[PDB]
Design a protein around this nucleic acid. Sequence first.
RNA 1: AUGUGCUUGGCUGAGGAGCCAAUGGG
RNA 2: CGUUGCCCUCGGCCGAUCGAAAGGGAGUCGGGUUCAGAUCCCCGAAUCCGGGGCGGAGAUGGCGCCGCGAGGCGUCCAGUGCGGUAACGCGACCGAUCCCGGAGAAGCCGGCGGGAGCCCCGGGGAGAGUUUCUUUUCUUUUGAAGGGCAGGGCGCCCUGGAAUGGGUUCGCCCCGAGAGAGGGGCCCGUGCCUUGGAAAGCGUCGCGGUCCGGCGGCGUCCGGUGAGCUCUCGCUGGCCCUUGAAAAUCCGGGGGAGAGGGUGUAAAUCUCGCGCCGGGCCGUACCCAUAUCCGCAGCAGGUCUCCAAGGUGAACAGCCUCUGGCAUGUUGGAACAAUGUAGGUAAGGGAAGUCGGCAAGCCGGAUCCGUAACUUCGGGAUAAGGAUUGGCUCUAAGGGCUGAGCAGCCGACUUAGAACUGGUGCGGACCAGGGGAAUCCGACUGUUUAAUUAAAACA
RNA 3: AGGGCGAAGCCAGAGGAAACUCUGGUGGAGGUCCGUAGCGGUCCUGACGUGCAAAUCGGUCGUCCUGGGUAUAGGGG
Lengths: 65, 84, 47
Amino acid sequence: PRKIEEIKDFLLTARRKDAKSVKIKKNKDNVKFKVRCSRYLYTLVITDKEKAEKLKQSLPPGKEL
Amino acid sequence: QVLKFTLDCTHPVEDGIMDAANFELQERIKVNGKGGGVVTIERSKITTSFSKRYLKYLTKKYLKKNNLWLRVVNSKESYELRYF
Amino acid sequence: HKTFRIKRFLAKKQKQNRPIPQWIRMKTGNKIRYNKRRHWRRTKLGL
RNA sequence: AUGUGCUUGGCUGAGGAGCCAAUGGG
RNA sequence: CGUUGCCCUCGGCCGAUCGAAAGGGAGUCGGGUUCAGAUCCCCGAAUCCGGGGCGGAGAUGGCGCCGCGAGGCGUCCAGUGCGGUAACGCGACCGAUCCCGGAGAAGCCGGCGGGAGCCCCGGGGAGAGUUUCUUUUCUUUUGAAGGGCAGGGCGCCCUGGAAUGGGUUCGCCCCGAGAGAGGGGCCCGUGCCUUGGAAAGCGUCGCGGUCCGGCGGCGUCCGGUGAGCUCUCGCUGGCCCUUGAAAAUCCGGGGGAGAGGGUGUAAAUCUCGCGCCGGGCCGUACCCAUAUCCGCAGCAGGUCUCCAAGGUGAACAGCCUCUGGCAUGUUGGAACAAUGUAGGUAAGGGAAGUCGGCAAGCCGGAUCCGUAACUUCGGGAUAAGGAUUGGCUCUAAGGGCUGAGCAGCCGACUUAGAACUGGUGCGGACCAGGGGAAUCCGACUGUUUAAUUAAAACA
RNA sequence: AGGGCGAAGCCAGAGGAAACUCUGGUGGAGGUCCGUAGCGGUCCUGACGUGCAAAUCGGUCGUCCUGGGUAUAGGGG
């Protein structure tokens, strides 16, 4: 797996052709967005709920755990 | 700073197999081995200070004392008596 | 740990350890009455 | 009399009571 | 780049080939699933090897017309990376035949240290047991790979210079070929954190039962200690007239033939980050041993390994227990004669027995005293001989963190000295050397007639 | 396994005019010792001797090796 530290890097990863899915995991403390790509699963960790919702809104057009 | 435990007894009291009048603990609860107003009992369900499993041990001791068909189990800081 | 040849030998020896079909007892010139049976403990394979 | 004491190690939460150690030992 | 002959050219012998399911040899782990298979099935997360995309790297720089434009033109000239004093570092960072080197690739034993698994101690939960006492007793309480940071190591670098020599280990060791001190670098990081990853697993309590990786709640929490056992990683010693594989295979370096493009890039990537495709063949059940193998058998025999907890105790001893397992080893019942096989005891005597103290009984552990002849000076030697040993209650001593010596908090076990106390019992079972004075032979340790001779024989 | 003895080397202390000696500690050698596992097989001339067994069993004992591969074949090894 790979851990992404920035929102823009996550957005670039999620727009890759080989990206297959994105899964959202609501944890007590944080939220995790996980993008399934060809080689690695990429995880972004967000501690702000409002920022999490904003990122959820801006996703490529093409599931929650 | 203050620890509270309930230890409800509704089911055996309602069926009349035991009264909630002999249980309310005051003469058996040990504080520092042998404790003043350090801990308190608020009978009603009961209730303040400590180990909760000490309360479970005392409840099972009381059940054995009165030949009580009953089981001590309900939520955090809360024990409940229920039938098998 | 087996080789292919040993395993094939064992498979052939396994397929030969069955009783005769009953209907063969009804043939016109039948002299057989039962099966060259082999037991893994009583008789050992040629290996 | 495995009768009754004593005693080692272990075991039954402790005790009271006992058991195991091809007859525990005395 | 599938094309033929030639030179401008190079290409030595370990000559084919076989030889290890324990040696060498890249790369897979977690969870779930069956009546019987799973590191192989499914879910998920990776990885190695082999075979024509995108990004990044190659890297936008330096007379003079307008311009104090950082504007583009006009021309010429550069550019096969950069940083650190250094050890070395950074995403990558051309290059053949050839040459040098490294790794693969090294014994046995000792001591010490780090890491982990297990064990142990004190608390917090969940369930269970007991119920005169016991806030008690038992059970239970994150993979590979990647990225950080610990802690372990370094004959690695820089400054500087040492005697009143210093540093230092359990031991040693080290130093003007450079110590101590200070500041750095590299390697290993199986340890912690994090992505994985809680969604799964487990525990407990409930709800839907047709099916059900069914749906839910709560939880999966804090510390401490060690000559402890097992594994591992290091460091430093000892022993050898013993010096403890080879090859496949993989890599670095030296050198420089060459290639690349002309001012916007081109050749090229120890090959840097992603992306694409593929990994055929054979084995895989189970037993593995008081009935799955060999011994004619479901034979008290033989047959290579890995893991292994609590108590006692020096202990992988013996004895008792937990996890796990079993049904007493080709039967059962009644009785308890002789003779037997295997154990126990025996008054008084104490080898009178016998070829012969045969066997079996005396001794036995620790602690404190004491120990002869003789000797190759190493020994003999636990020589011989004597005392003690329980339980309980104390005293004294033996460590780590806090501001020639004072106050707190933490901490594991010993040793010694006492008092009291038992119908003198106390290494209470288990475990566990009888001794001395001589002769003969062989120096010793070692070996030997599998199945009658272990010896003085052989070496 | 766990223990005993305890060599070389090393540290300190004491004695002595000196030469040097002594004492304590440290250290951990050895075809060393007691003794597990393993290997072996002394005695009971025990058991058994139509055996569990064409050589095994129990106490008592000695010491503290082993798988696989490969080579040597009968007057030969």
